[PDB]
Amino acid sequence: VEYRNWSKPQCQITGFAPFSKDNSIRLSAGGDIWVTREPYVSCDPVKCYQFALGQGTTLDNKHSNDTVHDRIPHRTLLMNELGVPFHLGTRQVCIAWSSSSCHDGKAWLHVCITGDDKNATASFIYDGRLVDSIGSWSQNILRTQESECVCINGTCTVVMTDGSASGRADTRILFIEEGKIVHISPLAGSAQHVEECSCYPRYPGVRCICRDNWKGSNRPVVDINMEDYSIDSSYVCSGLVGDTPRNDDRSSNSNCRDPNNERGTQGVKGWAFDNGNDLWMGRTISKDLRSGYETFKVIGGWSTPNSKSQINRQVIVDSDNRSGYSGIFSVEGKSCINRCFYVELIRGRKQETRVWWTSNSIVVFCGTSGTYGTGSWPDGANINFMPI
Amino acid sequence: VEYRNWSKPQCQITGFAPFSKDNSIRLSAGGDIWVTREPYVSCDPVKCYQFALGQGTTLDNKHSNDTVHDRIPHRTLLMNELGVPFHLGTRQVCIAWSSSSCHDGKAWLHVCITGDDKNATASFIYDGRLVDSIGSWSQNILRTQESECVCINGTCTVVMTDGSASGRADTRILFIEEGKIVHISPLAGSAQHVEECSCYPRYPGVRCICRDNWKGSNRPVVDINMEDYSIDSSYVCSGLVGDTPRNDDRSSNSNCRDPNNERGTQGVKGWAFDNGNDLWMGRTISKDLRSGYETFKVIGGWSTPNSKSQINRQVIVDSDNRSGYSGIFSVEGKSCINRCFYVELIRGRKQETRVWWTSNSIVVFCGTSGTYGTGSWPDGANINFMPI
Amino acid sequence: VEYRNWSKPQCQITGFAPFSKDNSIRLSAGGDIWVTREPYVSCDPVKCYQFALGQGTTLDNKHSNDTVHDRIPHRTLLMNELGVPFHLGTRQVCIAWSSSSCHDGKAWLHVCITGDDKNATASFIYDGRLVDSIGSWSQNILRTQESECVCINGTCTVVMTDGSASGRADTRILFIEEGKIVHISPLAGSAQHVEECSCYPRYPGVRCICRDNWKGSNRPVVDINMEDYSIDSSYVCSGLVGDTPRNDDRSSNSNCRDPNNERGTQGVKGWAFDNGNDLWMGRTISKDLRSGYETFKVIGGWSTPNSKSQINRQVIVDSDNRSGYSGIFSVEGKSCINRCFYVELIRGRKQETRVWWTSNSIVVFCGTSGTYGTGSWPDGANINFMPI
Amino acid sequence: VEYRNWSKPQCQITGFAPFSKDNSIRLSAGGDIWVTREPYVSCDPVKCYQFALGQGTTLDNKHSNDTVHDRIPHRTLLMNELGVPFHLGTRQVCIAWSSSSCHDGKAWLHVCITGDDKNATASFIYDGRLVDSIGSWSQNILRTQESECVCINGTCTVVMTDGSASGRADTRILFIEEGKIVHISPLAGSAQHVEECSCYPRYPGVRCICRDNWKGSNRPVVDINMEDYSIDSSYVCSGLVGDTPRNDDRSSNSNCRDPNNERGTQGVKGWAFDNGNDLWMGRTISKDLRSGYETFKVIGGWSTPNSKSQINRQVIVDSDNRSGYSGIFSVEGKSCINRCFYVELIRGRKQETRVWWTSNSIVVFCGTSGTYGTGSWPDGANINFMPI
Numbered sequence A, B, C, D: 001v002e003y004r005n006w007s008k009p010q011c012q013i014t015g016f017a018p019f020s021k022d023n024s025i026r027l028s029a030g031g032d033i034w035v036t037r038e039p040y041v042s043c044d045p046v047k048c049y050q051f052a053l054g055q056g057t058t059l060d061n062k063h064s065n066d067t068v069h070d071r072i073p074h075r076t077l078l079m080n081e082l083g084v085p086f087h088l089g090t091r092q093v094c095i096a097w098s099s100s101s102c103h104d105g106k107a108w109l110h111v112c113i114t115g116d117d118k119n120a121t122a123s124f125i126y127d128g129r130l131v132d133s134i135g136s137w138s139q140n141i142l143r144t145q146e147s148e149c150v151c152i153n154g155t156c157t158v159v160m161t162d163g164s165a166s167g168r169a170d171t172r173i174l175f176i177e178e179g180k181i182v183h184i185s186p187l188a189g190s191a192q193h194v195e196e197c198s199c200y201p202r203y204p205g206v207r208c209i210c211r212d213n214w215k216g217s218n219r220p221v222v223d224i225n226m227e228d229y230s231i232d233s234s235y236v237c238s239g240l241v242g243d244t245p246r247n248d249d250r251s252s253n254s255n256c257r258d259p260n261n262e263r264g265t266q267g268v269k270g271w272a273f274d275n276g277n278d279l280w281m282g283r284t285i286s287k288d289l290r291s292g293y294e295t296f297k298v299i300g301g302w303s304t305p306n307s308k309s310q311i312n313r314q315v316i317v318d319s320d321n322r323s324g325y326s327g328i329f330s331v332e333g334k335s336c337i338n339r340c341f342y343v344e345l346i347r348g349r350k351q352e353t354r355v356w357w358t359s360n361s362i363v364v365f366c367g368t369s370g371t372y373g374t375g376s377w378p379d380g381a382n383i384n385f386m387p388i
């Protein structure tokens, strides 16, 4: 086997094609399916896997009541082949209420985080063995990506932060070889607050579009130099803006340098990737709630301050349906490396009240250079048929 | 590994031997089994798999109500080893309310179709990656085979149509190498309307017996020249006739050239294959409803206009039991390549009314050059023990 | 890979050691477990598998009612690793209400029989493909081994019979290479009626201890010469006698040549194997019912007419618990080839009446040349906790 | 493949990092999960597996009532990948109410014990085949490790005892090559009573910290010389003491040579391992009940009589939650061999009375040379949501 070095042009894409949907909540009304959240899909050199943070219970289980809480000792990283849902024969790969997994070519690395908020611990499991660990540097919820990490020539890099949610925080980018933390680099550049990076290889670097939870609606950008371990950060140029809350397109801005300060506080995990000076990105259709999901290209979206010229829009989940987190993943193709994304469709509390649980299903699309039509692929569960 | 080129004589067969039955509906009254329809089985060079379009739910689930509808965003192509039923650990290979899968020797290709009726999109997933896609050319339900596609020396060919159901439509035959559409050829020859082809290798070509939904009871024939990408189409000569509705054998005809216009409209997916000037084929025993299933050889059935000389008949499902779609699949043997078939036994609505769901189970037989006896192998579920 | 030629001395054994138990009926009162009967375990060169004829349903299913019947179109041969029970993800390898499976070194062969009693059909599935078939020669329930077949240098041999149950019948021994019936040899020698052979390699031959359903309580012996395809048959010498009904040891006899005519009619599948002039064998503890199971060596049991000198007795299931069929299986060891056996513990109707189903679990032991103690390992299900 | 010879320095560790948790009891209130006890995890050269003694039933099954009993004929050794829980597709590897499993590099060895108390039998299954067996030498419950055995260069060694619980007993250490008992060595040295050894490679020897059930609260030490088959035994020096009941740290002692006679009788399976003259160990937080679990280093804990200097303490399960058995397991690292441990969290009777079953879940941690924080990871099931 050899290590992945991702040195292939990004594929030219026209938009996104349907790829998978696991239908976990519809199935949960007639099956023993895990309660999850924060899903992501990462993919080894032969096949893809879907991951999620389980709540240590199944939906038709009395223990599903009050699973809105993001951190309990019973959360484990579930790992399955993309498309097979989280049934009882699913493997719990590690204890984690925050994770990132990636494969370096030769084996999988999982960074799982559990523990006390104020004194959490992160374990670096590589190829089955626990090879390293690190404790909470700012005593306030050590967290990471919640989507795939990326590895070039042996080194994987994950970005993690500990600190305030909506306040300044301490973000560091760890570089790790075979499970072992070989370097830690603090965040440098313009970004004010990094939460949940959606990173992707951009040989010879890695680039991430993260979430700004303090002062923005525009999304942070974190650039990692795998050779010097140098970090750089910015905001995505596009005036169209990916976070939720967001202003609305008439009143929204980004100057590529600072948090725009328009409905800053909070976010939702999202992604975007550059294509020359253009930007492919996705966001909720709502600017207040995480409902609906749409994708489009923004001409000049990457390189020009405030560019709002959209084209190739696609609705992935209509505005009357719920979405959640979203992240990117890259698959090596024969000729180029493509970009794909998943979108979490959360259901349950607090928004839907009939039931007392909170869980999600996923839908995933991949870039295509061919043609496509139209559609909307929501979760599909009728809330009145669910248990609880 | 090397690519399949299927250059081996067709095996001489005497009739059909029992091969598999998964018992999905009997099992569904005491287990969490997927609701499906449009099953097919395709087979890689070491083993066989059964496929079906799931309705994103299990039978003992309130979401199974009203699964008669053929297209919803929650349908996925399920794939399992032949004989293991669609339980909750089954993989959903792609989003699809229409499909065709085949293996070129080196990996699997799946063509999955989802989307809006009027603007559907087809993704070409090969070896795990999404390698291509195509949008609806006639804005009216892009559809394909619903059974195995076939590949010779690297190129796979699927036939798809977009257009009217019972009216003229636009049928094209796509040739694809490693997931990539490398050529599209429109339907040429005598056939008036192609729906659901049951194709099979006939080195160096591929031959399909499809469904004519507009003007026939006799079945279309589509011949693909893998070297020039030339298409040709006809109708099966046999006066015995494979579609349902059908006239009855006294009053039925086929001249090998045109839709016979005897109870044309509608169909059911079926198959047939040639053997010299003879024809092996199967059909429902009923000519009105898709009930019972029988197979037989028709002497001169392939080459002579209206030949109705039957021999070697076998009942696979008695006339008092339901059948559904049927299709062919080919398995490479040591000496020759054999032909086998599956027959979908649908249950539920609209025909059976106690329950509110619609689903199927399968039974599959393979050609044999040996001896065999008699039997009838229906679905078996007692409708009064089923949920709903 | 290479073919198995089984040329290694039989291991010297002292008695039997516990090996597996799957606990299917206890589990069925809290799980979706298949209803089965006629189990057997066969073993490929790296691991072992347990097989059973399923009744196309699970126990907590209304379709389990009246599963006492031995032949319905919904019976399939289930195959799993020894120890993993028949849950819903179990593969149905073929349609069969009678079977025998074995592995020639290079792949598995399964002979599955389904159909009409009076006109059944047997398919020879080898390595996934259906390679041959044969119809019922005497129009009265074609049947076979119900335990492992054995293959030496490529040729597998199964013994099958068609004819009267308790009356004369037509027994033939088929020799098959890669799924293909290459020779059929009729039964020759002293045996009057062969039903359910428990065969085992005895290089260069194969030897079977079968069931005599017409005139005996002593067990038939069938000897196959793999080189000339010559058959020979006898009765086991031992005056202790393996069938049920049986007389009792005071009044029982066998002269090694003829059916003893002591409580002839009927039987139960059993086994025995020779060791020099001695005989290792097992039988129900009851002589009327198939309850309890015991094993022992009979000094001179193989070579001397009526020898009743027992030693090394072991109780495998106490007399207050039910047993059923039993059969042998051989595993290649480093030095010698060992013999092991399974014993079906049937539960349900007609003997236990609370419930309306009939099913079994298995327990299996293997020969040992070491020491052992004592015990009794019954099914274990409390009939009052079962569904139905 | 080659045999494991474990010749690598023990890794220097700082404490323990979270590794796995399977959540079996929370899941059992909405899933068909096996009732177990005496879990352990052993690990082959590529991945790890969790093992447990099943009670031949699932929790939501009426057969789970009264599973407090440690020995019934229906107990089997369940084996799964670490993290996938004991669902119905889990393999029952052998009949056993006591076990130890290990992998020699080339294949797995399982020593399973079943039978009558007074006349039990142990089978040595290696690589699938039953290769040997041994009967009860003292006619009073033959038992073994209940955790991993260890193999160096081909020879595996398990320690087993037969005799009184709280009284003198007969302990022997068997050395076995490929399933075959090649030598048996009786216990020699200072230890008075050995029960449940937690052994680990310490090239070229093997070292075990066991349970003294007669006269101690300090833990026995058993040293095996793989070259001469010589045994030696002692007590762990530390005055801090690992058994439960225990005195309390003010009043507790160990002189490294004799049972301390402070609350001797009974125990609980535990572990400890040396590091120079220090000792890493774990124990219940309670000294009366097996509740809570803590680990720490004891400076001079290995080499100095009665050393009570603790440091690096970690709470793994808080004192208000239940624990149970605990044992060690070793994983080969790139550079050194690490030590990890699991802790059984038993639930049910006799301590919790609402329910009538007894079962456990596991949590496992591995040594780390990095940093870590704090936490408590209990079972998590709310006893009021459980069946029964």
Ligand SMILES: *[C@@H]1O[C@H](CO[C@H]2O[C@@H](C)[C@@H](O)[C@@H](O)[C@@H]2O)[C@@H](O[C@@H]2O[C@H](CO)[C@@H](O[C@@H]3O[C@H](CO)[C@@H](O)[C@H](O[C@H]4O[C@H](CO)[C@@H](O[C@@H]5O[C@H](CO)[C@@H](O[C@H]6O[C@H](CO)[C@H](OS(=O)(=O)O)[C@H](O)[C@H]6NC(C)=O)[C@H](O)[C@H]5NC(C)=O)[C@H](O)[C@@H]4O)[C@@H]3O)[C@H](O)[C@H]2NC(C)=O)[C@H](O)[C@H]1NC(C)=O
Binding pocket: A382, B065, B066, B356, B388
């Ligand atoms: C499979 O699927 C199908 C279809 O699926 C769609 O189904 C629903 C449920 C969706 O949510 C999807 O998920 C799905 O896609 C199902 O089939 C349907 O099932 C329904 C039952 O669940 C059945 O019945 C419907 O159900 C609807 C909701 O469930 C109702 O909206 C509908 O009725 C509505 O209008 C009624 C108007 O009259 C109203 O009734 C009130 O009742 C009283 C009756 O007495 C009215 O008046 C009487 O009132 C007083 C006393 O109370 C006086 O009496 S008296 O005379 O003095 O004595 C009045 O004078 C007297 N009225 C007179 C004389 O006129 C009262 O006034 C009404 N109230 C009002 C405000 O008007 C009711 O409240 C509703 O508003 C009806 O119940 C569907 O028909 C059925 N569909 C089909 C095709 O069959 C399947 O069930 C599922 N399930 C399964 C297992 O498969």
Ligand SMILES: *[C@@H]1O[C@H](CO)[C@@H](O[C@@H]2O[C@H](CO)[C@@H](O[C@@H]3O[C@H](CO[C@H]4O[C@H](CO)[C@@H](O)[C@H](O)[C@@H]4O)[C@@H](O)[C@H](O[C@H]4O[C@H](CO)[C@@H](O)[C@H](O)[C@@H]4O[C@H]4O[C@H](CO)[C@@H](O)[C@H](O)[C@@H]4O)[C@@H]3O)[C@H](O)[C@H]2NC(C)=O)[C@H](O)[C@H]1NC(C)=O
Binding pocket: A014, A015, A296, A310, A311, A312, A313, A314, A372, A373, A374, B118, B119
């Ligand atoms: C079958 O399926 C296909 C594929 O999915 C689908 O085609 C796609 O249609 C969408 C929706 O119309 C297209 O996306 C739009 O693209 C335009 C820009 O392209 C046009 O204009 C440029 C020049 O500017 C030309 O070069 C080009 O040829 C086109 O003529 C965008 O403007 C669209 O964005 C606006 O509309 C969105 C909704 O569609 C809004 O949500 C968004 O906020 C934008 O609105 C704002 O700007 C408008 C003016 O710019 C203004 O009027 C508004 O009020 C507001 O201020 C959108 O990106 C997509 O490109 C097509 N993709 C491809 C590959 O063709 C078919 O439509 C579908 N058919 C059916 C029947 O379903």
Ligand SMILES: *[C@@H]1O[C@H](CO)[C@@H](O[C@@H]2O[C@H](CO)[C@@H](O[C@@H]3O[C@H](CO[C@H]4O[C@H](CO)[C@@H](O)[C@H](O)[C@@H]4O)[C@@H](O)[C@H](O[C@H]4O[C@H](CO)[C@@H](O)[C@H](O)[C@@H]4O[C@H]4O[C@H](CO)[C@@H](O)[C@H](O)[C@@H]4O)[C@@H]3O)[C@H](O)[C@H]2NC(C)=O)[C@H](O)[C@H]1NC(C)=O
Binding pocket: B014, B015, B296, B310, B311, B312, B313, B314, B372, B373, B374, C118, C119
């Ligand atoms: C045990 O199992 C075996 C194997 O399954 C089974 O054998 C098979 O039996 C079937 C049913 O009879 C055979 O199929 C029939 O074949 C005849 C033609 O063969 C005969 O005639 C030719 C000359 O024409 C001879 O060379 C040959 O030797 C035979 O004598 C067909 O005519 C049959 O079709 C008609 O009958 C069907 C029902 O059987 C109708 O549904 C069908 O529509 C046809 O009817 C029409 O034509 C008839 C005149 O041609 C007319 O009388 C009717 O009214 C109507 O117009 C059918 O194909 C099959 O070949 C056998 N297969 C083999 C390999 O032997 C055993 O029967 C079975 N035994 C038991 C006890 O179950």
Ligand SMILES: *[C@@H]1O[C@H](CO)[C@@H](O[C@@H]2O[C@H](CO)[C@@H](O[C@@H]3O[C@H](CO[C@H]4O[C@H](CO)[C@@H](O)[C@H](O)[C@@H]4O)[C@@H](O)[C@H](O[C@H]4O[C@H](CO)[C@@H](O)[C@H](O)[C@@H]4O[C@H]4O[C@H](CO)[C@@H](O)[C@H](O)[C@@H]4O)[C@@H]3O)[C@H](O)[C@H]2NC(C)=O)[C@H](O)[C@H]1NC(C)=O
Binding pocket: C014, C015, C296, C310, C311, C312, C313, C314, C372, C373, C374, D118, D119
């Ligand atoms: C712990 O576990 C071990 C291993 O399982 C167990 O040892 C085994 O015990 C059984 C039961 O006793 C032994 O099997 C018996 O063997 C005798 C023959 O051996 C003796 O005699 C010969 C000479 O004849 C000596 O060479 C030899 O040393 C022995 O002394 C058989 O006769 C036994 O069969 C009779 O008894 C059965 C019940 O035990 C009956 O069901 C059976 O029908 C036979 O009865 C008939 O014959 C009797 C006279 O022959 C007559 O008295 C009766 O009325 C009737 O007509 C049986 O095979 C077995 O060999 C032992 N195995 C080994 C390897 O040692 C321990 O017993 C067990 N301990 C505890 C406490 O549980």
Ligand SMILES: *[C@@H]1O[C@H](CO)[C@@H](O[C@@H]2O[C@H](CO)[C@@H](O[C@@H]3O[C@H](CO[C@H]4O[C@H](CO)[C@@H](O)[C@H](O)[C@@H]4O)[C@@H](O)[C@H](O[C@H]4O[C@H](CO)[C@@H](O)[C@H](O)[C@@H]4O[C@H]4O[C@H](CO)[C@@H](O)[C@H](O)[C@@H]4O)[C@@H]3O)[C@H](O)[C@H]2NC(C)=O)[C@H](O)[C@H]1NC(C)=O
Binding pocket: A118, A119, D014, D015, D296, D310, D311, D312, D313, D314, D372, D373, D374
């Ligand atoms: C975030 O997470 C980290 C990592 O888990 C955690 O750090 C760890 O904290 C624990 C708990 O305090 C530390 O363990 C203690 O270590 C001391 C010894 O170390 C000190 O003293 C030596 C000199 O003796 C110095 O060299 C060294 O620098 C330290 O200053 C032990 O004494 C502790 O044991 C006693 O306390 C236990 C409870 O903590 C008792 O249960 C135990 O029985 C011992 O008590 C007895 O002795 C006491 C005097 O010796 C006496 O006062 C008592 O009454 C009684 O007689 C314990 O082992 C551990 O080493 C830290 N690990 C590392 C790597 O740093 C952080 O605390 C955590 N932060 C938050 C906010 O959660």
Ligand SMILES: *[C@@H]1O[C@H](CO)[C@@H](O[C@@H]2O[C@H](CO)[C@@H](O)[C@H](O)[C@H]2NC(C)=O)[C@H](O)[C@H]1NC(C)=O
Binding pocket: B002, B005, B006, B007
């Ligand atoms: C079809 O594929 C087969 C399988 O590879 C080809 O067989 C090879 O061709 C010649 C002799 O037939 C030699 O190159 C090899 O020895 C053959 N393969 C094997 C596995 O023996 C065959 O030529 C192909 N035929 C066509 C018409 O394409």
Ligand SMILES: [Ca+2]
Binding pocket: A212, A213, A214, A215, A216, A217, A243, A244, A245, A263, A264, A265, A266, A267
């Ligand atoms: Ca924000």
Ligand SMILES: [Ca+2]
Binding pocket: B212, B213, B214, B215, B216, B217, B243, B244, B245, B263, B264, B265, B266, B267
């Ligand atoms: Ca028609």
Ligand SMILES: [Ca+2]
Binding pocket: C212, C213, C214, C215, C216, C217, C243, C244, C245, C263, C264, C265, C266, C267
């Ligand atoms: Ca008899």
Ligand SMILES: [Ca+2]
Binding pocket: D212, D213, D214, D215, D216, D217, D243, D244, D245, D263, D264, D265, D266, D267
């Ligand atoms: Ca003690």
